[PDB]
Design a protein around this nucleic acid. Sequence first.
RNA 1: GUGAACGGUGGAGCAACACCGCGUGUUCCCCGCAUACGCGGGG
DNA 2: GGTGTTGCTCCAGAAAGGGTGTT
DNA 3: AACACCCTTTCTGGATTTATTT
Lengths: 329, 280, 234, 241, 219
Amino acid sequence: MQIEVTVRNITPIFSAAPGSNYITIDGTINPPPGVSRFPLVRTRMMYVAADVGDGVIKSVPLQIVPGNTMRSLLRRTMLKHVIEPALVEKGNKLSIGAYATAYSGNATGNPDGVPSSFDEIATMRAHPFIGLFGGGPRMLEGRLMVDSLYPIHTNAERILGAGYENEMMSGPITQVVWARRMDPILNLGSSEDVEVINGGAVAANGWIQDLLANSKAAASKKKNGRGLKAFNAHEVVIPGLKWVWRISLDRPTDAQVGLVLLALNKMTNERIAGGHSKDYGRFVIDGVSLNGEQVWSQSGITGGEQYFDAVAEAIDGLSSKEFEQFAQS
Amino acid sequence: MQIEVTVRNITPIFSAAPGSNYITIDGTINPPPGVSRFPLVRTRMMYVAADVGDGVIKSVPLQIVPGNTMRSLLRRTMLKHVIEPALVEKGNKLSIGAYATAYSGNATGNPDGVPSSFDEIATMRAHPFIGLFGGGPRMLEGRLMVDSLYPIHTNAERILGAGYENEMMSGPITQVVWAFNAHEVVIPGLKWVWRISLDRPTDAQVGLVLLALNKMTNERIAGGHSKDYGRFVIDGVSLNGEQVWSQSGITGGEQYFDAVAEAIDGLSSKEFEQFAQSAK
Amino acid sequence: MFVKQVFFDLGARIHADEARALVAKLLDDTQPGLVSALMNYMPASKTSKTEFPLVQFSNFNQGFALLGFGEVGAQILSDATPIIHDAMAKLFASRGQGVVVQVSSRDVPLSCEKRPYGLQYTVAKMVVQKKHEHRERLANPETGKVFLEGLFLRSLERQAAAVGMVLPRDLVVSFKGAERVSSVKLRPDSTLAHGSLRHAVFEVNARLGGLWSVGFLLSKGFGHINTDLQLGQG
Amino acid sequence: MRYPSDIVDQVLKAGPDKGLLTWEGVDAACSHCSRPIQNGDLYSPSSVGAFFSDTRDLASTSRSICWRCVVLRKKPMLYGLSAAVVTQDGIYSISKDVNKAWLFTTPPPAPFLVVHSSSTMQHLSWRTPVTLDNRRIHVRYGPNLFIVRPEVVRKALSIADRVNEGQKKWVTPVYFDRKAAAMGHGLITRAGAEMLTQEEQEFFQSVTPGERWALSYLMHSKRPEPEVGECITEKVMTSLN
Amino acid sequence: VNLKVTIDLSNPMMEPGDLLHLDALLGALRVSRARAEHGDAINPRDYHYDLPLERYQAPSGDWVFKASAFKLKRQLPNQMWMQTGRLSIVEAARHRQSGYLQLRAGKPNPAGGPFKTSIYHRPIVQAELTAFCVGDQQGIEALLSECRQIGGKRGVGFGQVAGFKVEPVAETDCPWSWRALPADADPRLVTSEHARCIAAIRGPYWDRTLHVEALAPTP
RNA sequence: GUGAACGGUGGAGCAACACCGCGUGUUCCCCGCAUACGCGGGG
DNA sequence: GGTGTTGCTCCAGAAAGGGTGTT
DNA sequence: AACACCCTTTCTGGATTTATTT
Ligand SMILES: [Zn+2]
C-alpha cells in the first residue's frame, strides 16, 4: 500500500530552523564583525548526496519540510475532520490521558509500565486509528511510514528515482523577506483629536517621556527593557513549484486505507509548517497515485470503493471505550 | 472564509525594498562597470516559478505589495472606522497599554514566558476583534490569514491560473521616475487580486471584515503619501466563491451584518484591559 | 568627530532665535546649569563664551532643532533632551487642549577630503557684517571678495579645530554671488541690525561630508546647512 | 559495582525506609535499575507521577522499585548529582572544564558512573550503565548515552596542538557545540580545510558523538590542564540526611 | 560459506548509538516474515533465533552468532537533526469548553505534564554499510530483499535502501569477530579494540535485563 | 524481535521617512592679541 | 559630488507540601 | 474516609562559539 501524493504550493512555505543567523542590508549572510547586522530566521534544509553525470556524488543543499511535521498534519486532519464529529455525534467524551495519547502519543496518562498480551497487541493493531499511529503507555508500533516533502528539483535526483525529468526546476528556490514593527503611540500627531486614551494628550506625553528617560539612562550607562520598534528578516521558499509526498502502509486493513483516503480528501483546507498570520503553507493537490494507479480527479478521489465502504462501516461503533483501554489498561 | 478581493489602482504603487541598487541614466540597472552610477530605489518583489520557454520552469520576478502592510491596513481601517467610534461613544476609554496592544499586537518588547489559562484563551478567541488579530503578552494565535497583493499577470499563472485564464496582462509593469532620487513604481490602471482567509470564524467576525472592506476604499496602499501614490478602488468581491459585490457596496450576506451589528452594539473595554494586562 | 541633531515637534513652527529666548525663559527659574550649558554661558557669569559654540539652535519645519558638536556637544544634548521635552509639554498643556510633542535624533559623522576640482555649496541666511570696516569692505567687489573668501576659509578652520579633527591647509575657496541682501536683528524692536547674505554660493576644491557652519551668529541658527543633502542632492 | 544503584549502599551508607513491602513469589526486575527483586527483598510499588517523562527509559513493566532506587529518586540526589563521577572511594565533580579534562584524559582507574545534566533537574542515575573498563567510558548527558575513548580524545588534542604551532593566535580546526545541538556540530572549518591532511580530516569525520561532545569542552583557545574534581561526598551525604 | 554484505541507501539515516549487528536486522526481518505468515498474535522470541547463520560456542555456554556489526563508509559531512514534541492548547481549550475533553485543571504547564514542550537533537549520516558473517547466501538474500529501511526513526522516512549485494570471500578475508563477544571468548578472536563493558551479546540488544559482562568494540 | 518502539519549531509585528523653499535694515554691550596705530569674535 | 533608524523577544524541571473533592 | 487531583515554593554549578540555502 504505497501512496504517492503530488502537491503545488500557492503561497510561500516557511519551516523555521534552529540557530542564530544574521543578515546585512545587502544579501551577505553571517558577515564578519564590524558591519550592521540584523537577525535572520531561515527555512529548514538538509544536505543530501546527489550523483551527477560526473559521478562525483558531492553534497548539495535541499529545502524540505520534515516528516514529523507531515505525520502530525495527517494525524490532526484525521482527528479533526473524521474522528471528532463521529465521536461527538454519539455523545462521547475523552479523559486527559486518552486525549493526550490520541492527539500526541503521550504516555503521561499511565507513566508507569503497562504490560500487554500478544492477543491484546494484535487487537489494538487491528484498530484503524490506534493501528495507524501507536504510542501511549504501551509504546506500540504503528503501521504508518510518512516521508518528508521533497521538491521536484535536480538536487533531489537521488531520493526521487525517475520519471520526474520533465517539469523539473533548477537553481535557487528561496528568498529573504524583511519585516518591521512600529510604535503606535509615536504615530500620534500633534493634531491629536484622539480621546479613546484615558489620559488624552497627557498619557501619550508620559509614554514619550519614559522612552526618552530610558534612552538617556542607557546612553549614560554605555559610556533588559525593550521597546516596540523592530527590523528583522526571514527566509521562505518561493511559491508555484511542485513537491512529492510518499506514504506507506504496512499490511493494512481496508478501513485504515479508507481512513487515509478520507484524510487526503478532506485536506487542502489546512496549511503546511508555520507562518500562520501571513497565509503561508497553502497548496493544491494535482495527483494521487494508489499503487501506481491514478485515482485523483478534479473533485476528490475516484476509486477504492472497497476501502471507502470498509471505512464507512468502521466509522460506526467508534466509541471512547477503546481509547480509554488503549490509554490506561 | 476564503474571501477573494479584486482591486484596481488609479495612481502608481510604491513599496520601497531594503537594499542598494544602481541605475545609469535609465539605460541599465547594476552595470558591471562603475561608470555613470546613480542610486535607484526598487519596489517590493517576489520570485515565482512560471512556465517560460514552453516546457521548462524558471523563476521570474513579480511586483507585489507585502501581506504585512495589507494586514496592518486592514487592522487600522477597522480600528478607526468601526471600533473606535463605537468605543468612544457611551464612554469606555482605553488605557495607553490597551491602545498600544490594539494597534501593534504587543504593548512591550519582552513577552512573559508564562502560559495562559484555558478560559482566557476560549473567551479571547471568541472576541470579534481580539480573536481576529492575536498577540498580547502571551502571544495568542488569531484566526485571520492575510495574503499579499498580486497583479493578475501571466507570470502568476502557476498561482492563480485556473481562476483567470483570460484577462491576464503581460509585459513590464514598472516605470522609473527621476523625482535626483530615482525610484521605480508600478504603473496605474492595473488589476490586482487579494486573498483573505479565516478559520472557524463566528458570524460577527465575518461581519466585521465586511464592514472594514466597505470603508477601505478611502485609504491608501503603501506608497509615498506626499506624491499621492497608492490610490485604489474596490470591485468584484467574492465570498466563498459567490459574488457579493455591487456598485453601492456589498449588498449580500445579511446574517454577517446582523451579527456584527449586535456584536459591536455590546462591545466593552473590559476585554481590552484583560487582554493587554501582563501577568509578569 | 560627529554632530548630534535633535528635532522637537510642537505641531507649529517657531524661529530658532525665538526658540532660544523661549528656552532661556522657561528654564530660567530652575536648573540654571543646564541652561548655561545649552547657551554656552561662562561658568560664573551670564555672558556667553567667545569660542566656537558647541550647542547651537537650528531650523525645523514643525518646531526647532538642536545641534551638538563633538562629544561634549552630544553629551549636553543627551542630558538636556528629556528636560526640554517635559518643559515643552507642560507649557503647551496649560493653554489649550494640549499637543503631543515628538522628538527625533541623528548622529551625523563629520569629514573632509581634498579633490582636484571645484565643488558647489550654497549657504542660506549667512551673516557677514559686524563692524564698520566690514561694511566698507562690502562696498567694493574686489575688496569684498577676499573678505568673504577668508571668512569662509577661517570658519571652516575654526569648526574643524573645535570639533577636534585635522583639515588640509591647502584648500582654495571662491565666492560666486548672492541672491539677496537683508539685515538681521539681535533683539526684536532694536534699531541695531547686522548685514546678511541670502542664498550665497561658495566653491571649494575639497568635499565636506557633514553639518558645517560658516559666518557669524552661529548659535542663533544662521549660516549652517547640511552638505550631505547638498552633496548628490536627491 | 555492577548496577547503578550499588552506590546507594557502597559509596554512601543508606538503609531501607522500613515502610516498604517485602517481595513474595517469583522474582522480577526493578523497573528503574534492572536489578532482580528476589524473595524477601524490600521494594516499593511504582507510583511515578504524571510529571514523569521517562516512560521510554523504563527497563521493564513489573511496576516495582527496589529500596535503592527509592533513595536514588529523591530530590537531593536529583540536584546533587547534576555533574559528577561516582567511584568506590567517593563522589567527585566534573563541572569545570579542567575537571572534564582530568576525567576524559587520564581517567581514574576503577569502576565508576558518569552523569551530566542538560537541564534544571533530570533523572540520570538509574538509567546509565556503570563502566567496568577505563578505555571505554559510558557517560549520560541529558537524554543522550555517549561512549568516550580517552585515546581518541588525546589523539585529536595532539593534532589540534600540532596544527596550531607557529601561530600567535589559536584557531580551531573543527567546530564543536557544548550543547551538541547545532546543525554544523562537527564540521570542518575553512581554516581547518587548509592545515589538515586528508587522512586527518577523515579521522575527524569518523568519531563517536560522545567524543565530539567532550572535544567541545576540551578544544578551545585556552587549553585546560587536568586536575582532580572537588570531593562532594559529605555534602551530598548531609543533604540527603 | 564465508560471505560479505553491502548495503546502499538513498537517504540519510539516523546514526546508531551502539553497534548495529547484522544478526539483529536478520532477526527483525525473520520476525516480520513470521508475522506475515502466522498473524500478528505471535511470540517474537520464538522465531528471532531461526537464522541462517553459524553460532560460536564459547566455553561454558554463552553462544553468539557468527555475524559482525555494520561499518560506515561516510559520503557526507556529519549533520544534526532537530525534532520537537508539543500538544496544542487552543484546540484543547475549545474541546474543554465544549465538554469533549474532561479536564479540570486551570492552565497548562509547558515545563512538564501532558502539555510539555520538548526539543531533542540526533545526528544523521549517509554512508556505505558493510558487514561480515558465516552462512548460506541463498537463505540470506531473500530476507535482505524483504528489507526496505535501516536504522532508527523508520516511521518518519529515515534510511531508505537503494540496493544490496552478497558475495563470497576468503576465510581470512572476512572478520566476523568485530562484535559484542562473551567474557570467556577465545583470546584469538579478541582484538585490542574490544574492551570490557556491560552490554547485550544476543537477542534484542535494547533489553537491559539481559545485559551481561562482555568485550565489545566502540562503533 | 534494526540500543528498536512513541514525539508539530511554533505563536505576534506597516520600510518610508527625516534632513532643502519661507520674518528682521545700522553702531550697542562684552573677550583676547596687543599695548592702543588697530586687528581678530562672542551676543 | 548622500545618510541616519532598526541591529529580537520568550522556552522546552520534577519533587514536596498543603489544600481540597469525589465517593 | 481515603486516595485522587490542583496550586505554590525550591534547589542545584560554568563559561565559548562556525558558516556549501536569490
Ligand atoms: Zn533499581
